[PDB]
Symmetry: none
Subunit: 221 residues, 6 copies
């Protein structure tokens, strides 16, 4: 990554072995969890695009998902080129040249360009742009590994109601809609696909009952 | 998080892999325990609200509680706006504008704005304010995942005194009520619902007795 | 804790996640061993009192014993207040106010008071004073949870002498006793309540014999 | 490894126990799979040749592959000699005379000479040179221990599409070609050797479509 | 402990969490093997007497041995007083006072004196002296916990000869006497108590044959 | 250890507790494979002779091999004494004496004597000399814990050739001999003791084949 310190000191650093291991291990034991996307965001503070690409490379298995992520990055790099073509011209030693999309995706990632972009003012935010494209590719993958229809999420008679709520809101987190459509799922689907008696208990509270009211009401009395 | 270096000099840092994994693991094994709230305080000493939000979102599982916490945070953010209307008009060049509720919860915010609040004068503690709201949501969650009412706690005939006193104090930690009221609970309930023979012993010790005295008097059943 | 760097530069630091994890695991998994008191002392050096309280409070389970420690801490706060009444009237600035007992246990404290007390010369060693109160409380818990009366410990018939000596000296560490009382216990109880076969051999050996000599006599007995 | 201190002061550090153990573990779980190449590059961010030799030699098992790597390193040293025959005539001790392949690979060269070459400026970047020779040899091992030919991979009558894609892209990952040749393999073979029920669905979808579209269409059998 | 930092700088520090944890694990898991002595010395490099006392005191379990070690430290403290008495009078600020044996053992573990002794020019090596007393007691414990008579130890008929030799020399390292006695025991018992077939070869190698020759000779016997 | 830090500043350091633990548990779980020597080099960089002796002593189990190593070191110490007889007289102040074998092998070398050797000019690398002696003894141990003669190793009629080549090259590493002799064994024995089918393919590559060619050729049976 690149680390800033007190007294304005800025150092590129190698990726710590333990950080790399932790990322490989989340994929090994939990695959493309819902927890994974934000975990990637936490580990990628201050990253270089080249090292982020190395982190994608070390993932074991699940190579169909890895291809979908690579395609997602490639599509976004082409969009960047269409809006922001790198214009011709010589530049002085000590100056920066604007990024093109495949340089951001890491194919021609000189370590010096990456350091130079971060230590120019204003910063040339290649790490943020690359991370965002990776996040978009991950969101596709999480939906793919959340195979169950939202309309098929139902409380059994053996489930405590709270477990059904846990499944429902995990599924919505990994299968977005517009903010309005998701709000409609909370107000329509959640009561509808509860077990009959629990569903009756929620209806008495109302159609816009808070989740706090729903949790307190349905525990067993 | 936010480190405070030698001579009080303050810089945003990446989190350790091992901090992230430890927080994720305690939630994975124990849920939102009663132990979790002080552990969250220990891990969060100096942090931007966006990073704190990252810490909340890297938890998966237990999503009925997690959604309830997000709604609770949103209500508290609205209270901040009601109390502290944010100036829509102009500000002096260099003076930071008050935070609004969305900024405190990172939802409508840049990381640099958040750092600005922690580094300007005054160094408005937006990270501390966001943690206070997260803690309140967690305390409600801890009461939700309690499954025992303090008013029902009874020592059996065969149950030893030691088991009963452990249930009573564990439950009292999860009573999200006034601390003064908890003192009333210690004086009143603990003696009243003891095993009949041992209640007689505790009444004889009478008001002002220490727990040390109660435990030695009631060794056994 | 507080980390002291080269050139007398003393900076308060975060609780190490890993140090806190070690403390919670010992109390939860090993309970109120004899090993707990010294392990606590080693990990609680150089602690700002509110953080030291966080370290106590992030331990859970055993909640009657934990409450008994909090009560013991409050008794010590009562002694501290009686011994050192507050300096009445207007408090002159610069010099930190001399604390009350609740403030020392941390409930009312600010981080700025805590830094001020430790970084003044002379210092007010608030973290040490609180640590002494806590260690006294732990000794009370270890005594309370080692209910075997040392006078009554006997050997079985099919026991080697060593297992009895291990039990005897563990019990002695968890019994209230001056060094003079320990010396009497050592020379009175230990050989008298031994298994008949070993006790015959030890009496023939005599009283001046050390424990090293006694262990040598009873190798297979 | 080499650690860059403040102001560019390069100081060698001992091999880290936990870096070395991490390399040994990746070899234990996965052997010489295509994950090895990026994992090796990440752990050799700052490696000396001495570290690199220690890393190769500590592997247990897999000794046919390890011997093949060492011969491949011998081949690369011979290519270095052919390109860069070391000029005749005398050069003082201390002047960093050019190395030949055998010094670079490090058997016939002190650690201190190697550190001198990489850390004086301008350098003769022996650590990077040797690391590259290892990477070329590893790429051949990765091809050798791929066991499936891409032409033969069929999606069975019972195999799910996701697993067929996983197999195909691991196999391509371990038998890399020119980027254009790889792109042709993705457009031609993957659709063609899909199960016949799903291949029709893909032809309807397009004349070669994105993998994200292909995964959505082929969610059955 | 005391650490020397770069440039001959003495800094007193806390006992490392991790060093103390490792020492506590050694006594929980491995009892008083002959491996304990050197492990303890290595983890206690740099220790004040107060730190050494903290390490002894964190041991629980096996408490008869621990009590014997404390008595043994007291016996050495009495030998130190007998050799070296204390002279009357005051000492200047800037001088070191000669310690009683109890002071070296850490009974009045005044840390200021202890740091003073190791950092004065020239020093009193109080911490090393205490370590030698601890080591003497630990050796006595190692003999106590190695109950098997070495004179009974023979080769199994089913055992490989080499495993019998491993047992014999571990036992001799646990019960060590004069070097003269150990050497004679190694010559005499090891050959006599082997298998018939193996011992016949060893005598034919000579009446002083090396352990190296003995190992090569008995592979396949 | 002795750490040579930036700008040549040599400072003595404590043994790392994590370094020591990694060495000890490698030996106890994996014993003396032909992984041991390089692993020993990784964990002993910059050791003093005293540290090296600590590192061996701390290991236990497999004690007949450990005594054999101690004598191999004693034989080397006698060779050093024969080349570097004990000299008498005063010596220059600052120009440490030429060691004798007992100092190199640690017992007679105080911390001040060893520090003297590495910190005077010109420096005498007593730690390295002792490390080379230990490594020589380890190579003897590794051969003793090889069980298989390289001249017996053959590929079955049904064993895969891939397993045979792995077995051959592990065994060849654990025979003591010149690397040049090992090279002749690789080109002579391995083809001769393959199975008829594989051997016929190998002889069509003829004299000069690399393992990369040979392994690729025999992927078919």
């Amino acid at each position: 990554p690149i680390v800033q310190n007190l007294q304005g000191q800025m150092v590129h650093q190698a990726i710590s072995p333990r950080t790399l291991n932790a990322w490989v291990k989340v994929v090994e034991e939990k695959a493309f969890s819902p927890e994974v996307i934000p975990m990637f965001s936490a580990l990628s503070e201050g990253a270089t695009p080249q090292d982020l690409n190395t982190m994608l490379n070390t993932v074991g298995g699940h190579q169909a998902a890895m291809q979908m992520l690579k395609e997602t990055i490639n599509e976004e790099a082409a969009e960047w080129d269409r809006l922001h073509p790198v214009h011709a011209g010589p530049i002085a030693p000590g100056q920066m040249r604007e990024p093109r999309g495949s340089d951001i995706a890491g194919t021609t990632s000189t370590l010096q360009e990456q350091i130079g972009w971060m230590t120019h003012n204003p910063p040339i935010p290649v790490g943020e742009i690359y991370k965002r494209w990776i996040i978009l590719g991950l969101n596709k993958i999480v939906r793919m590994y959340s195979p169950t229809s939202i309309l098929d999420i139902r409380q059994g008679p053996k489930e405590p109601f709270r477990d059904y709520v846990d499944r429902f809101y995990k599924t919505l987190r990994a299968e977005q809609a517009s903010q309005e459509v998701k709000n409609w799922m909370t107000e329509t689907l959640l009561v509808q696909n509860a077990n009959p008696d629990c569903k009756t208990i929620l209806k008495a509270l109302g159609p816009g009952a808070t989740l706090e009211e729903m949790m307190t009401a349905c525990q067993g009395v």
